[PDB]
Structure formats: C-alpha cells, structure tokens
C-alpha cells in the first residue's frame, strides 16, 4: 500500500569492494500487519549503523551469515507503526539488530529489541554509544579483558565506531591507553578529543613493532583488536605476561584474499596470553548496567562521541565503501527519513 | 667432596638441533650444605623429565628463560641428602621444577616442591602422571577449556607426555575425543591402549583440513594444542561456536625458523573462539584435587600411562633429540642413579 526502497547485495565480498555489489530496488509493503500474524511489529526505520562488522557478515564463511539478492539487515532505529506484540504500540521507538536497509521493515519475531526511553539524547546515539557500538566496547573491555587498575591498554582503529569508546572507558577506568588510526586528522583528533594518553598513525610508521615499544616500554596488558593482520603480530611480541586480547574485528583481511599470516603464535605460551573472539549479542543481558554507568558521564561532558551522518537511503552504498577503505571518521550512520 | 656430572647447553636452539649443543661436564660438589645457608636442601637427583616444553625454554625469547653455558634445570625426582629447611630431612623424596641435569643439586630456595607420599607407585610417575605432565593435562583441560558433558575434544601429539592424559581425562569426563600422532605404531597404540574414540596419523593425510571433518562432521569444541602451525589453522576452520583452544605447546615451530603462518584468525570472531596459552606452574594450588581424583583410577586399571626410559646421565642428549624430532614414544624420562 506504500512503496518501500530496499538495499540488497550482489555478491559475496571476498575482496576489492565495488559499489555495483549493492542493488538499490523499490518494493511494495502494506502499511499494516496482515491477518494471522501475532507477535510482530511493522516499523519505519530511521537511522542505520554502518560499522566494520557488516563487512564480516559478507564473508562467505559457514550461521547468522548475511550474504547476494537477500535484503541487508543490521542495527537501526525504527518507529513502531503497527503491532501485534503487546510490548509495542504505534509511535514507540526502538533499536535492535532486526532493522532492514529499507524504509519500512516487518519484524516478525523481535527478541533483542530495546525500548528508547528517549529523554533528550539525540536519536542517533541509540545507534552509536547507547546501541551496539557502545555495548560492544563495554562488553569487549570489562568482560573479556578483565581490566585491573593501572594496566597498559591499546586500541586499534580508535577512530572507528568501537575504538573511540574503548579508550575513553579505559582511562576513566584508571589505565594507560594508546590509540592507532589511519590519518593525521584522526590522530590529533584522537589525542585532543578523547584524552588518549597518546596516539599515532599506523601507516606513518612503516614498522609496527618499532612503534609499539616507542609508546609501550613497559609492555602491553590489554589489546582491543579491530584490525588483526601483522599488527596483531606486533602486539603479541610486546604483550606482558598474562595479557589478554579481545578480538572484535579484523579489518586488514576484508581488503584482499590470502590474508596476512601471524607467525608468533608461539609467544602465547611463555607469556600466557588469552585471546578471545567475541560478538556483542552474547552480552546483551548487561546493557542495563552499561546504560546506568554511561548515564551520568554524558551531560557532565565526561565522555564524548562523533559521527559521519550521510542522509538518505541511496547513499548507504557510498557510505559503506567509506568504512571499507577507511575514509570515514567516527561512526558511519545513514538516515532514511526525518 | 664428591664429583657431580652436569649437562649444559651450547647455543640457543632456533632450529636444526645438533647434539653438539649439549656439553657434558664433570664438576665438584660438597656432600653437605655450606655454613650460613639456611632454608636450603642438597638433593641427589634420580629421574628427570624430557618433555617438549624444555625446547621452548631454549627459544631466545624475552623471563624464566632457560638458555648457553648455564646448567639445564627442569623437573625431576630427588632425594634430600642434607637440609637447612625444616620441611625436609635426609632420605626424603620430592619432585619439582628445581632439579638440575646433574647427579647432585643444591636447591637454595625451594618453593613448588611436593612431598613424595610414596606408597607403592613407581617412582618415575611423579615425573609423569603425578608430576608436571599430568598436572599440565589436568590444568589445560578442566580449567582452561571449561569442558561440558558430551562435547567434541581433539588432542594433538596424543602420544606425548601430556596428550595421552588429556584424552583419557576427557572421555572419562564424558566427551567424544580424537587423537593425532606421528607413526602407525602410535596411532593403534593410541587406539588400543587409551580407548580413544578414534585416532589417525597426521602425515598419512597430506591435507589436515580434509582429515578433520573425516573425524568431526559435527565440528570441534575443545582443542588441546601441542603442535600449532597449520594444524592449528585447520582446527580453527572446524571449531564449533564458543569453542576453546588450550595452547600447551607449538612443536611444529621448534624445527625451523620462519614458523608457519596462521591466516584464518578472522574465524575467531564469528564463532567466538577462546584461545589461551598457559603453563602448568600457575595452576599448582589445584594439585591436591588433581591427585585425589587420579588416586582411585590408577589401581582399578581405569587409566594408564607409558614411558621411554633411558638410563644414565650421559644419554640425556640423545634422549632430547628423540622428542625434538618425534622419535620418542610416551614420556621421555632419564635415570641418573638407581
């Protein structure tokens, strides 16, 4: 009864991303739920997330796998238009992992949806800090890395949707932190905006190992991995005993086949390194204690966050190549309406 | 006052082990402790352990590092001859990580020594099951891997000093287990002697990935890593979600420089793999609950174990190349006296 513009994929992304791999279509959708369909909500999407984890969802690996004609689904903000789930009614705002890259989405069995409880916060922050990215940074740091007071912490891609929060949580926790991003603009931004104890550009130093003792003569305890590759090789060579590595992303391998090899895995034994891959969805029962912790540190100016707004559905393809090659800054968020 | 024959190293072992790297010397030692030396024991060694972890101690890496003229020290059985530590007196037997590759060792500050409590068990088993190897297999399985009832378990080098126990503990725990060794004799031995649900030879199959779904069509949950290398690459490709990898050794890299690379580290995120390196010394406060668990399962024939005795101090160099190239079977133990 109303037209719905979807954004679909066109092939598994092994490497060399092309904008032709995203087919923008126009479909129909009824503005209310069909008969015999209880426990479902029809929503109008608003803001969608564009974080590196979606490129991993296109891997062509074994479960939860996204990838070509199927419609793209990820996190987003959506207004309930009609509902057969008594937890929701018209006009209510929510955010969850069931938002399609479309104007109107029919969610047939919502599970991890969280109520907006809107207050005065910008609505895009339930896609950034108050959504999956902030929940990812929180879960990856305190739950995985078991941080102790006054330990060395290091964050890759600290300009991304997750890293800019890992460093802020870690210094406010009470730890030495260093960040790494891929542009002069980001480095001093990461230095001036977030209070990072230090930062640098990883392609300025053509030798990762030399640059990591330049900032960590005492070794490193905690590593939040968003890049992987041979940067992960350099970290292991500098880890203190009983160090821990929370692996959230491996962006260096999204670009090309035959990913870079890691050869110093032997070091995991003599310095007893714990390395754990993780995804945010397994740590959603801790979102309450996450939010009430972030609640005060917002309006006192204690923490901050920034985005890269790209209004409209059509752009999303151009905004996805922005995070794929690293041209984006902060959090890539696309607006479909309002 | 009595001659003491030491065995020392000659160079860091990056690769290509040569027996010339072990210099057999003859030194002197007083048969009693010198004056002004409280809290020390002088011991006569008996049986020494020769497990793959000692080759790692020769790495040339950063702490606890063994390596060339310095005398080799590892686990062993020793009789207290004289003592200034009131916890020990003459004639008492113990075992710990402070046994030198010599006939008589002067231990100046014993810490992790454990009393023999001898009973009737063979004295070599406080170097095998009742010593570091059994404590390593126990700590690496139940503490690191958090095994649940009826999960898929896989053990590399299941003929080694540790793997032959990991599989026995795991099936008696209540789990499906598969082993991997490097000789026809070992495979059927591993099959007939230990009740392994299956086993194979890793160099019989010239493609590790193909052989691992041949035995695990359901995936793998737990991997006890004693080899590393590209066998670890194949395991990660077959791990179930939330799988865990306890890394005890990486023997494939002891042989050659430029160790084999692991490229599928990306898989750690979508299936949430926990990989942890570990050493036994950090889990010695659980040796009591280890021993009282093994206590019954010994003389009922429920568990077994085998060695590769090589009597005398002089051999130890020839016995060390046996585990370096894999020619040994079971547990390599050298006897220096009795």
Author numbering:
A (entry chain A), B (entry chain A): 1 to 62, 64 to 68, 71 to 341
Sentences from the paper on this structure:
Pulegone reductase is the key enzyme in the biosynthesis of menthol and is required for the stereoselective reduction of the Δ2,8 double bond of pulegone to produce the major intermediate menthone, thus determining the stereochemistry of menthol. Pulegone reductase is a double bond reductase (DBR) which belongs to the NADPH-dependent, medium-chain dehydrogenase/reductase (MDR) superfamily. In Mentha piperita, (−)-menthone is directly synthesized from (+)-pulegone through the reduction of C2–C8 alkene double bond catalyzed by (+)-pulegone reductase (EC number 1.3.1.81). Some DBRs in the MDR superfamily proteins have become important biotechnological tools for asymmetric synthesis due to their high stereoselectivity in the alkene double bond reduction. It has been reported that the reduction reaction proceeds through stereoselective transfer of a hydride from NADPH to the carbon of the substrate.
In this study, we characterized a novel (−)-pulegone reductase from Nepeta tenuifolia (NtPR), which can catalyze (−)-pulegone to (+)-menthone and (−)-isomenthone through our RNA-seq, bioinformatic analysis in combination with in vitro enzyme activity assay, and determined the structure of (+)-pulegone reductase from M. piperita (MpPR) by using X-ray crystallography, molecular modeling and docking, site-directed mutagenesis, molecular dynamics simulations, and biochemical analysis. Phylogenetic analysis revealed both NtPR and MpPR belong to the MDR superfamily, but they are present in two different clades. To investigate the structural basis and underlying mechanism of the stereoselectivity, we performed molecular docking, molecular dynamic simulation, site-directed mutagenesis analysis, and biochemical assays based on the crystal structure of MpPR. We identified and validated the critical residues in the crystal structure of MpPR involved in the binding of the substrate pulegone. We also further identified that residues Leu56, Val282, and Val284 determine the stereoselectivity of the substrate pulegone, and mainly contributes to the product stereoselectivity. We uncovered the key residues in the pulegone binding pockets of NtPR and MpPR, and illustrated that the hydrophobic interactions and potential steric hindrances may mainly contribute to their stereoselectivity toward substrates and products. This study not only deepens our understanding on the substrate and product selectivity of alkene reductases, but also provides a structural and mechanistic basis for the engineering and directed evolution of pulegone reductases, enabling the production of enantiomerically pure end-product in industry.
